[PDB]
């Protein structure tokens, strides 16, 4: 019996990534889609099936919904995940889970008391390319790791470029460098006209001095890459956070007098993340690692926001 999924918010990202994944995944059935405008819900249900619902509370009342996907703007995550969980529904929440660590702890506490899965959806984590890269690094392809860089920048209740984009390179730094990353410094550029973070750069370090330089932004040409500098080489890759489902990653390595490129298989990370969430809900095995990684993520995001030098232009 597929888990029955309801969507709250007819988000662009839902239309483009999550909802086609739900639709194709045998283990999940889209049973309800809510919007602030019934017309918008109905356009989504005409596309992906389920019952179109006006307003979010009505969807949370349905007995034919086991789990809810929340692709709302970040600042609105906490209210709605809290309500979904109190309505007894497991929750897949688009990254970032929420806005700060104390809020994320309280959301996980509400979940825990009810035996429900709360999962922060970083679709990139479900692409096998990162493990294949980490296996190459562990095999010593570029020697010891010295430093890491990652960047996600795109051309121009919104979350700002830190919450909405910066979280990606920060989460990859956690994925590769481990659980002891500490803030060192950062800059956030804030546009006065709208009062909104439009870009930033942050420096983190592990306690051994392995650094991460993370760039993010929405006033930029498109970049989406990461890079490792090693004692005997370097490794980089593009399209690291949002490779198409059919796209073959290419790992680039350079060392003294010799470079190589490896083409990896294509994978649908969006399908795989929806499958991971469904399988956990179905089995009741809610990996502890997911929640602990999300809490450490939330801490580093707060430490960046708090510690950054903030610069307002013009
Ligand atoms: N461009 C992207 O897709 C992108 C990039 C980076 C990160 N993210 C993340 O993905 C999530 C969704 O971001 P998004 O930028 O895709 O949001 P979006 O297109 O603005 O969609 C959010 C949906 O939320 C609902 N909503 C409720 N109150 C709203 C309000 N006051 N203003 C606007 N929408 C409101 C709307 O659904 P109804 O109108 O149907 O109620 C809207 O379609 C966030 O966690 C964000 O960090 C998205
Ligand atoms: C390829 C590409 C994209 N974009 C723009 C188009 C879009 O405005 C932006 C992001 O496109 P994308 O990396 O494709 O990822 P999703 O659409 O899955 O978005 C999310 C990203 C993060 C969290 C959730 C969803 O970059 C470009 O400007 N040039 C490009 O070559
Ligand atoms: C799915 C997932 C993982 N994690 C956390 C939990 C775990 O701490 C970490 C990775 O989990 P995994 O992708 O299964 O591990 P692999 O070895 O296949 O991939 C590596 C790739 C690179 C370097 C290490 C591992 O992310 C999450 O927080 N949420 C998720 O949805
Ligand atoms: Cl390339
Ligand atoms: Na600050």
Curated annotation (Swiss-Prot):
GO terms for biological process: antibiotic biosynthetic process. The keyword NADP applies. The keyword Transferase does not apply. InterPro entries: Gfo/Idh/MocA-like_OxRdtase_N (IPR000683), Gfo/Idh/MocA_domain (IPR050984), GFO_IDH_MocA-like_dom (IPR055170), NAD(P)-bd_dom_sf (IPR036291). It catalyses: dTDP-4-dehydro-2,6-dideoxy-alpha-D-glucose + NADP(+) = dTDP-3,4-didehydro-2,6-dideoxy-alpha-D-glucose + NADPH + H(+). Substrate binds at residues 17, 222, 242. NADP(+) binds at residues 10-16, 35-36, 56, 72, 77, 164. Its EC number is 1.1.1.384. It comes from the Bacteria. Pathway: Antibiotic biosynthesis. Keywords: Antibiotic biosynthesis, NADP, Oxidoreductase. The active site is at residue 95. One of its GO terms (molecular function) is nucleotide binding. Belongs to the Gfo/Idh/MocA family. Involved in the biosynthesis of L-digitoxose, an unusual dideoxysugar attached to various pharmacologically active natural products, including the antitumor antibiotic tetrocarcin A, and the antibiotics kijanimicin and jadomycin B. Also able to reduce dTDP-3-keto-6-deoxy-D-galactose and dTDP-3-keto-6-deoxy-D-glucose to yield dTDP-fucose and dTDP-quinovose, respectively. Homotetramer; dimer of dimers. This is dTDP-3,4-didehydro-2,6-dideoxy-alpha-D-glucose 3-reductase. It comes from Actinomadura kijaniata.
């Amino acid at each position: 019996n597929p888990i029955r999924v309801g969507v709250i918010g007819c988000a662009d990202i839902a239309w483009r990534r999550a909802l086609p994944a739900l639709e194709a995944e045998p283990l999940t059935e889209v049973t309800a889609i809510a919007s602030r405008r019934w017309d918008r819900a109905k356009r989504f249900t005409e596309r992906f099936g389920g019952e179109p619902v006006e307003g979010y509370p009505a969807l949370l009342e349905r007995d034919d919904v086991d789990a809810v996907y929340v692709p709302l703007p970040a600042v609105l995550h906490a209210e709605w995940i809290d309500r979904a969980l109190r309505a007894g529904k497991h929750v897949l929440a688009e990254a970032p889970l929420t806005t700060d660590r104390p809020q994320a702890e309280r959301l996980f506490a509400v979940a825990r008391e009810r035996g429900l899965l709360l999962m922060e959806n970083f679709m990139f984590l479900h692409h096998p390319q990162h493990r294949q890269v980490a296996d190459m690094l562990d095999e010593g392809v570029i020697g010891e790791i010295r430093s890491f860089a990652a960047s996600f920048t795109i051309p121009p209740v919104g979350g700002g470029a830190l919450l909405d984009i910066g979280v990606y390179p920060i989460r990859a730094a956690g994925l590769f460098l481990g659980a002891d990353l500490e803030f060192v410094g950062a800059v956030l550029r804030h546009e006065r006209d709208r009062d909104v973070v439009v870009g930033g750069n942050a420096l983190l370090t592990t306690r051994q001095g392995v650094t991460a330089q993370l760039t993010f932004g929405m006033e930029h040409a498109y970049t989406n890459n990461y890079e490792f500098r090693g004692s005997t080489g370097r490794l980089w890759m593009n399209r690291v956070f949002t490779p198409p489902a059919t796209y073959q990653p290419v790992v680039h390595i350079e060392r003294q007098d010799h470079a190589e490129q490896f083409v990896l298989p294509a994978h649908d990370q969006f399908a795989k993340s929806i499958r991971a969430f469904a399988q956990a809900v179905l089995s009741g095995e809610h990996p502890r690692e997911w929640s602990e990684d999300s809490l450490r993520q939330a801490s580093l995001v707060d430490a960046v926001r708090t510690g950054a030098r903030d610069i307002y232009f013009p």
